[PDB]
């Protein structure tokens, strides 16, 4: 749930309401994936 508008047509796809911490950890995994995807040896958005 974020104020930024984004279209969701796959809310039918199953998902629970994660705690803010849970979302952050999932986000951290996505971020590690992005760094490896661009082969980033440096920290990305760590303050974020």
């Amino acid at each position: 749930e974020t104020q930024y508008p984004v279209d969701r047509y796959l809310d039918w796809i199953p998902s629970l309401r994660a705690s803010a911490a849970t979302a952050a950890t999932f986000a951290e995994w996505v971020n590690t994936s992005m760094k490896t995807a661009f082969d980033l040896s440096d920290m990305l958005l760590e303050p974020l």
Binding site: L16, R17, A18, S19, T22
Partner: protein
């Protein structure tokens, strides 16, 4: 009666909760004790 009062003179330190990963509850944050075998406490805390 006085001793029961004497035995109860404590400060309750704010505890911690964990989002439920199972469908028994709707991903609730359960007060989580340190150490294992807390599930006996979890079942007692929420007979529901």
């Amino acid at each position: 009666l006085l001793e029961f009062v004497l035995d109860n003179l404590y400060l309750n330190r704010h505890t911690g909760f964990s989002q439920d990963h199972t469908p028994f509850t709707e991903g609730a944050n359960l007060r989580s004790l340190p150490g294992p075998d807390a599930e006996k406490w979890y079942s007692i805390m929420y007979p529901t």
